[PDB]
Amino acid sequence: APEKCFLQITGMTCISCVSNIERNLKKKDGIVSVLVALMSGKAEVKFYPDRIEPLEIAQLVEDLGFGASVMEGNVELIITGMTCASCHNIESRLMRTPGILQASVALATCKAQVKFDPEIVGPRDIIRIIEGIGFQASLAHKEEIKQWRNSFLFSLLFGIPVIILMIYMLAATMVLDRNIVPGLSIINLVFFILCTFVQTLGGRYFYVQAYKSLKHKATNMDVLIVLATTIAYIYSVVILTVAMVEKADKSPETFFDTPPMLFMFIALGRWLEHIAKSKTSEALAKLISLQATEAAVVTFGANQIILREEQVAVELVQRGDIVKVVPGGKFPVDGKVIEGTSMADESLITGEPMPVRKKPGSMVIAGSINAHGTVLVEATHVGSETTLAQIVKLVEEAQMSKAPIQQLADKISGYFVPFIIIISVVTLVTWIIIGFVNFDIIIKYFPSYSKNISKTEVIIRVAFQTSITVLSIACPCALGLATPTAVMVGTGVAAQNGILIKGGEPLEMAHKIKAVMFDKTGTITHGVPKVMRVLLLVKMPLKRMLAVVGTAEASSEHPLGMAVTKYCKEELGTELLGYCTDFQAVPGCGISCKVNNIESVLVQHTVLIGNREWMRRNGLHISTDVDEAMSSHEMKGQTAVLVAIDGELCGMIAIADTVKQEAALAVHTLKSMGIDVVLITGDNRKTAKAIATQVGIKKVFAEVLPSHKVAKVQALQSDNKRVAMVGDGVNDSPALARADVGIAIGTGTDVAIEAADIVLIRNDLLDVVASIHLSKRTVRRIRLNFVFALIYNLLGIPIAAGVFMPAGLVLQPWMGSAAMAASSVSVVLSSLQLKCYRKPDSDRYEARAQGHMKPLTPSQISVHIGMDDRWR
Ligand code: ALF
Ligand SMILES: [Mg+2]
């Protein structure tokens, strides 16, 4: 019992791997018990220290074929009625009981924390003790959109009148120019009030965002707008104040137009950007729902002593408890099957729908679907140690590992901010130099000389005005709309094309994909078995035999049986099945039936269906020719079942999974573009190799656990490659979250759909190629939009700086407004034009692969099993 040792085991890929390890280790003398997990690769061994040593245990595990290395409980409860400090009694009683290390209770919140050894004490014991005492105990982004929307609305409310007044003044006005005081004017006063409101309210979020950006040692669009608007607002106030002091006859021109203009559009762009980025992460909630909510704890044993059956919450269960699973109910916790035989569906881990036989001494997975009978399970892993919980942890880690991507607008603004400052400073110094040296150019191009102020003031004031005009014109207005507008339009195109894209990230990353991994079941081939071929081993028509088999197999519940029946129905008129029929079945051995309704088949004695073992035990042998056919069929990893009548061999039926017709074309198309194709699946190597040969995938991975899939994705990403994961099962969810781009089949599991960032509503593999092409068109359009959001402003900078002054061109007041409309309209029109995109026709893909596509020999395909390639 004492000196329990901890071991780490690698190279295990099956639950049968765990069962063999446990059985062999327990068989050896000295070893008392062993526990181990599949994905965690962690094991605990209890043995007598005086008989065997940890080094021997590691050597024994290594001999089994799995690498072994030697390496080194808290409960929170809420208790009612904790209104008195004396009820100290609870803590003292807990300390008295063995196996409890510490226990404390807080009177302020009635919360209690207990630390103990799980192997000796559990939460149930503490709860029972508390109940006995006399008290009950029980175990314990949109903000950005809202604030951006508020800022945009406030700017629009206090910014629209600013634009309306400007249009009225420019288009047409002497009344508005009337001066209440010599330095100010009614029009100027209105501009100042509205601008102040916009800056105080609309610019509040801009200031903090820029303030936060500065703490990040980086500059982005928010910093650019804040600096530009603040400078323009400050200068306007100063010129107004000096004009009032100097009581000038004519009020100076103010730059109150800019801050309302930039805040409105930038806030709108940021609001649109965050709306597109909005997404849901309900995948974690779906995974939690899979776990069972209750278990049927048993008392004593199951041989000759049984007293009570108690419904206990899964969280309250502890290791070593015995639970009962009814058929159709989920397994509550991982454990060992004792005195129970039934069918278990383990699509959570391996992903296939084929049930796996469970026999006493075997192991089960939490969340697996039980059927065919009742089962008694001895829990071994509970709580977060369950396999399902480990998957949830992997999904959480993958989601948290997705760092944010810097927007192209922010990157452009990073270089823009120094650029505008440099030209603004350069424009200031040169104009000051020009005025000081000559002072004649200023008079010719500026009537300000008529004022009585000194010459130095005129040259300084004009230089400051010219530099600031350059700065205001330089700052773009449609920069924020460049990316979000195209992204939203691109998403609409995807929706019209049967592709659902969650957020704008996938559209900006699919074009970077260089490696794609496809799951086998459901993704590359249909998830339900289908009859592949039928052969004849007196010589009745094949159709009559098929009808006879269908009637006998009508009541069968095996997926193969129903697949055979539907295939027979399709081959026949399937008007109605025969009435008279007797059914008898030996599970895992075969099925026998009595059919005497052959007349019904003719209008439209004994039937035996089974395998090699059934024939051998029934006195029927296997011929050489038929045996060779079975070996060839089995070589392709497909099931085969033989039919006999009245003890005489009749024929054989082969059932195999049919690959999607477009899977081969999609794989070839991806390869033609220089994108690697990888087939990763949890099925046996034989089936994976056959599927890969059919579709032409060079790299095949088989017997892969969910943890292994994440590792493979991480390994591919480590090589600077972008990985696009395609899957439909629960086991694929952690890979989809970890992958750069996640694609979920439309008919797949709910968890897979939520985890994946892209959903194929039309469940056609060609959409993966189409999505990459659609992303390429979007990114190219986004860059063009940025040009439209900068070229108009860039062309205006020389005019503001006065480069074209000698040519007769001057910065007219309406140019600033004109630049906005041209840039905003151009960006919107450019983004909207993406709606004309059309999905490439399947004929084009076929024509492009008329001769390039060619089947691949099975000998050239390399099959790798496991992560370390320990096995062949
Ligand atoms: F269908 Al799979 F891994 F083969 F999810
Ligand atoms: Mg699948």
Report the separation in Å between the CA atom of 232 and the middle of ligand 1, taken as the mean of its atom positions.
60
Which atom from ligand 1 is nearest to the alpha carbon of 729? Answer: 5
Cα(704) to centroid(ligand 1), Å: 9
Query: Which of 258, 278, 298 delimits the end of a domain?
Result: 278
Give yes or no: 519 in active site: yes
- Rounded to whole angstroms, how far apart are CA atoms 345 and 720? 38
Say whether both 553 and 443 belong to one domain.
no
Q: Are residues 166 and 224 in the same domain?
A: yes
Q: Looking at ligand 1, which atom is closest to the CA of residue 350?
A: 3
**Residue with CA at minimum distance from ligand 1 atom 4:** 681
Residue type (1 letter), 189: L
> CA angle, corner 102, sides to 100 and 106, nearest 5?
125
Q: What's the alpha-carbon Rg for the chain, to the nearest Å?
A: 38
Cβ neighbours, 10 Å, residue 458: 19
Which of 732, 733, 750, 753 for a ligand 1 pocket mutation test, highest count of atoms within 8 Å of Cβ?
732
| Ligand 1 atom having least distance to the Cα of 527 | 1
Q: Identify the nearest ligand to the CA of 748 by its number.
A: 2
538 and 651 both lie in a single domain: yes
Indicate whether 721 belongs to any domain.
Answer: yes
In a domain, 673, yes or no: yes
Q: Which atom from ligand 1 is nearest to the alpha carbon of 709?
A: 3
Judgement on whether residues 111 and 172 belong to the same structural domain of the protein = no
CB 614 within 8 A of CB 590: yes
CA of 288 to the centre of ligand 1 (A): 20
Q: Are residues 681 and 648 in the same domain?
A: no
Ligand 1 pocket member 712 (CB < 6 A): no
Write the CB contacts of 498 (distance below 8 Å, at least 6 apart in sequence). 760, 761, 762, 764, 767
- Is there an atom of ligand 1 within 6 Å of 346 CB? no
Residues 108 and 219 in one domain: no
> What span, in angstroms and rounded, lies between the C-alpha atoms of 388 and 333?
9
57 C-alpha to center of ligand 2: Å? Answer: 37
Q: Are residues 29 and 87 in the same domain?
A: no
Give how far Cα 237 sits from Cα of 105, 187, 193, 704, Å.
Answer: 63, 14, 11, 69
Strands of the sheet containing 356-358, edge to edge, are 356-358, 342-345, 369-371
Residue 706 CB less than 6 A away from ligand 1: no
Which CATH number does the domain housing residue 736 bear? 3.40.50.1000
DSSP 10-43: ES--SHHHHHHHHHHHHHSTTEEEEEE-SSS-EE
Task: Quote the CA–CA distance of 565 and 546 in Å, as a whole number.
Answer: 9
Q: Which CB contacts under 8 angstroms, 24+ apart, belong to 90-97?
A: 90/129, 90/130, 90/133, 90/135, 93/129, 93/133, 94/126, 94/129, 97/121, 97/125, 97/129
CATH number at residue 38: 3.30.70.100
Q: Is the distance from the beta carbon of residue 435 to the nearest atom of ligand 1 less than 6 Å?
A: no
Number of domains in the chain: 6
Catalytic hit among 334, 410, 519, 767:
519
Q: Residue 181, SS3?
A: coil
Residue type, 192: F
Question: Six-digit token pair at 620?
Answer: 């029927």
Give me the residue label for tokens 């634009």. 163
Q: Of all protein residues, whose CA lies closest to atom 2 belonging to ligand 1? A: 351
731 pocket-lining for ligand 1 (C-beta < 6 Å): yes
Residues 6+ apart with CB under 8 A from 335: 323, 363, 364, 377, 378, 379, 380, 381
**Residue at 376 is within a domain:** no
Q: Which method was it determined by? A: cryo-EM
Which contacts qualify for 848-852: CB closer than 8 Å, 24 or more apart?
848/669, 848/672, 849/665, 849/668, 849/669, 849/672, 852/668, 852/672
The arrangement of strands across the sheet holding 741-745 comes to 499-501, 758-760, 741-745, 723-727, 515-518, 676-680, 699-702, 862-865
Annotated binding-site members for Mg(2+): 519, 521, 728, 732
Residue nearest to atom 3 of ligand 1 (CA): 681
Within this chain, do residues 482 and 581 fall inside the same structural domain, yes or no? Answer: no
Asked whether 338 and 322 are in contact (CB, 8 A), the reply is yes
Q: Given its phi and psi angles, is residue 247 left (phi above 0), alpha (psi -120 to 50 degrees) or beta? A: left
Taking the C-alpha atoms of residue 607 and residue 552, their distance in angstroms, rounded to an integer, is: 7
Answer whether residue 397 is part of any domain.
no
Q: Clarify whether residues 47 and 104 are in a common domain.
A: no
In a domain, 322, yes or no: no
Single out the residue in 628, 656, 684 at which a domain terminates: 656
Query: Is residue 153 domain-shared with residue 271, that is, in the same domain?
Result: yes
Where is the domain boundary, 251, 278, 305? 278
Mutation choice for ligand 1 from 526, 657, 681, CB with most ligand atoms inside 8 A: 681
The answer to whether 710 and 504 have CB atoms below 8 angstroms apart is no
Assess whether 80 and 58 both reside in one domain: no
Is residue 380 situated within a structural domain? no
45 in any annotated domain = yes
Backbone angles phi, psi at 642, to 5 degrees: -105, 145
DSSP 360: T
Q: Cα–Cα distance between 340 and 814 in angstroms, integer? A: 86
Asked if the structure places residue 676 within a domain, the reply is: yes
- Cα–Cα dist 609/649, whole Å: 10
Q: Give the burial class of 844: count Cβ atoms within 10 A of its Cβ; 0-12 exposed, 13-18 middle, 19 or more buried.
A: exposed
Question: What is the span of the domain harbouring residue 103?
Answer: 74-140
Residues 825 and 792 in one domain: yes
